[PDB]
Amino acid sequence: QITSAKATAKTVRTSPRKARLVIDLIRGKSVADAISILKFTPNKSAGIIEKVLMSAVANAENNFDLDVESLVVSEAFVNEGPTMKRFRPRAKGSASPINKRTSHITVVVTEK
Amino acid sequence: MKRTYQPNKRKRQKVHGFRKRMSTKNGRRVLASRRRKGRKVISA
């Protein structure tokens, strides 16, 4: 019997550097602790990781596992997605580029 | 700070339009060189 479940979000419109500050606060924790830690951080990406973590938990409960009380956050990371390209007009007739970045976010939960 | 392009409807037709290009011998050189390239607009 498999004892593990993942979820992932793809091309979310946040930057991958800032999402990594939040996700290092949550790695290796029990699922009980991670939710309250995410509820009290006011950073934009804190509530997106909350949804990915909750999908991992629902998958565990319904598709395979049981025992929401035993679960632990075992793996977590943030990768890069494709970037949009824009230009902002500058002084004296020239222009400079601007990157609109994206993230893939994946969380994994094991029974222990 | 007045720029160079000030739009006007009559002037654009009177300086660049089909009949002005048709009335000279060099205007028709222009129209033939545009038809030979495949332009969807040959005269303003």
């Binding site: 939040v22 309250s36 009290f40 | -």
Partner: protein, 56 residues
């Protein structure tokens, strides 16, 4: 002033070691158990200091 040399991966990451986040004092509510910030109202049940506050 302009950077005379690009900065490598090790020096960038050595700069970035004091660039983190903290999650300071979190306790358990006295009324309903769930975690909450100390000296704040409990957002789950609206109780602070053993009484009801976000109600009428």
């Amino acid at each position: 002033a302009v950077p005379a040399r690009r900065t490598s991966k090790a020096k960038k990451a050595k700069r970035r070691t004091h660039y983190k986040l903290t999650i300071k004092g979190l306790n358990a509510c006295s009324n309903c158990g769930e975690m909450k910030k100390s000296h704040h109202v409990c957002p789950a049940c609206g109780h602070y200091d053993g009484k009801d506050v976000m109600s009428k």
